[PDB]
Amino acid sequence: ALSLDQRIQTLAYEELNKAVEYHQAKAGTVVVLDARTGEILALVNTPGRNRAVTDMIEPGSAMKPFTIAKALDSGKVDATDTFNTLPYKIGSATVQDTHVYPTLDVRGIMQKSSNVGTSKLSAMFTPKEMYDFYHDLGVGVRMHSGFPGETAGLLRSWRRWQKIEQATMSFGYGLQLSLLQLARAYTVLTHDGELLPVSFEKQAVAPKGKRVIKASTAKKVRELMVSVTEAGGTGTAGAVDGFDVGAKTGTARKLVNGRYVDYKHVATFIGFAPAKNPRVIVAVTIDEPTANGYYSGVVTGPVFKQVMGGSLNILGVSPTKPLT
Ligand SMILES: *[B@@]1([O])OC2=C(C([O])=O)[C]=[C][C]=C2[C][C]1[N]C(=O)[C]([N]C(=O)N1[C][C]N([C][C])C(=O)C1=O)C1=[C][C]=C(P([O])([O])=O)[C]=[C]1
């Protein structure tokens, strides 16, 4: 028997289709995982191939929690540390944020989705340390999910990284993974620091997780990620009534012919709830919205909200706070 929950599958399908229609987008996908087992509760794509497993995207800002996790886990950074987040150069490349903040603490880097702050965290580590961490999250690794045509994604050897590439990989460019790989990587945060295998079969034995970060680090990162869905974060459209939700938005210019183009984007929204003791991960991507807005928050945040909210209801998880 499949691990798929048909009521979640139905909800995800309807919500995805509504958003793809409304935003006149090219394509999209939803993955729902069990946060403590890695079982696939739902996996839906717009018509055609199984893009969730076959296609690789650059994660963009959806990678930033991992860079933050690695920093905190090393003991070298505390969440209250403040960083200079002004634009700066690497060789003759510029790292800069959409909206300039002079300084941000780690909570701020998460909340506001700072490229500069993320790159400063990664710059405390060597290429080999960062590569090993991305590898350990499963980037460029086969999941062996049972799906045919499953991509391993792309993680170039650290032996060939330029300094700019370390920076850009820390905020999610130059490495690639499927939506299912990206949802899987979030089990590190939900399953107390251990990466889980993904499966579409009902589990019979407790899955063997592989330790990537300390449980204390995973807990802290989940707490920081609630900032994304509260006032001041990029991801308030994904807030769910009655729960605290940890999430990350991602808005990427689309890589098309080796070029990154400024008039095509890919919107990603990934999160988990309840944030303190999560039951589910929901990941959403919509490719090339064209109806006006293209930011993750407006395009994918409402599908995340409805699928997460509906999923928690279906699985019989009580709200942790009064509905409003
Ligand atoms: B990230 O996705 O977080 C966000 C979000 C969000 O949280 O939803 C919204 C807006 C900006 C950002 C910053 C993060 N994304 C970006 O920085 C985007 N960057 C890129 O697409 N690229 C392409 C490739 N390279 C070289 C490898 C880059 O350095 C790079 O940064 C981004 C997103 C939107 C824009 P636009 O079109 O609105 O100007 C530009 C860049």
Question: What is the whole-number distance in angstroms between the Cα of residue 116 and the centre of ligand 1?
Answer: 12
- PDB resolution in Å: 1.9
First to last CA, the chain: 38
Residue nearest (by alpha carbon) to ligand 1 atom 40: 253
Q: How far is the CA of 29 from the centre of ligand 1 (A)?
A: 20
Nearest CA residue ID for atom 32, ligand 1: 252
Give the whole-angstrom CA distance, residue 252 versus residue 114: 14
For residue 284, give the H/E element and its range.
Answer: strand 280-287
Q: For residue 252, what is the domain's CATH number?
A: 3.40.710.10
Collect contacts of 216-219 with beta carbons under 8 A, ≥24 apart. Answer: 217/69, 217/72, 217/73, 217/193, 218/69, 218/188, 218/189, 218/190, 218/191, 218/192, 218/193, 219/192
From 90, 165, 166, 253, the mutation candidate for ligand 1 (largest count of ligand atoms within 8 A of CB) is 253
Residues with CB under 6 A from ligand 1: 60-61, 98, 113, 115, 168, 173-174, 234, 249-253, 260, 262, 295-297
Structure tokens at 295: 């930011």
State in Å: Cα 173 to ligand 1 middle.
9
How many angstroms separate the CA atoms of 323 and 317, rounded?
A: 14
Q: Which of 3, 61, 227, 311 is catalytic?
A: 61
Map residue 242 onto helix, strand or coil.
coil
CB half-sphere exposure, 155, CA atoms < 13 A: 22
Ligand 1, atom 18, residue with closest C-alpha: 252
Cβ(41)–Cβ(280) under 8 Å? yes
- In the residue annotation, 61 being an active-site residue is answered as yes
Burial class (CB in 10 A: 0-12, 13-18, 19+), 279: middle
CB 137 within 8 A of CB 185: yes
CA atoms of 138 and 178, how far apart (whole Å): 11
Q: Which domain holds residue 257?
A: 1-324
Structure tokens at 291: 């109806």
What 3-state class would DSSP assign to 258?
Answer: coil
Q: How many domains, the chain?
A: 1
**Contact by Cβ (8 Å): 252, 57:** yes
Residue with tokens 């869905």: 229
Helix (H, G, I), strand (E, B) or coil at 176: strand
The helix or strand, by DSSP H or E, that contains position 165, with its residue range, turns out to be: helix 163-170
